[PDB]
Design a protein around this ligand. Structure first.
Ligand SMILES: [Ca+2]
Length: 104
């Protein structure tokens, strides 16, 4: 089964854990990767019920299972906070322009 489903993408807890670890390390190092510069600050304008406190940061999680290294980031993102706590997994799949919907 999928622990998280973003549109047609299936993710296991292992996959979110791995993506989060990479994003958080970049966060600690003050570094970013890709043309859009990830990890970047996540603003919760959609008002998703996370039980972890802000600030929040978004990092791409890839359907391939590969850790994001540049190139196309796809539509899915792992949201983590300043204390390296997982807030959730979101996606642009099925949302107009910059809206996000939560993975199921
Ligand atoms: Ca996987």
């Amino acid at each position: 089964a999928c622990d998280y489903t973003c549109g047609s993408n299936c993710y296991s807890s292992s996959d979110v854990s791995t993506a989060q670890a990479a994003g958080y390390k970049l966060h600690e190092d003050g570094e970013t990767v890709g043309s859009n510069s990830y990890p970047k600050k996540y603003n919760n304008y959609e008002g998703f019920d996370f039980s972890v406190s802000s600030p929040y940061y978004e990092w791409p999680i890839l359907s391939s299972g590969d850790v994001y290294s540049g190139g196309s980031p796809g539509a899915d993102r792992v949201v983590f906070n300043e204390n390296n706590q997982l807030a959730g997994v979101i996606t642009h799949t099925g949302a107009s322009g910059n809206n996000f919907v939560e993975c199921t």
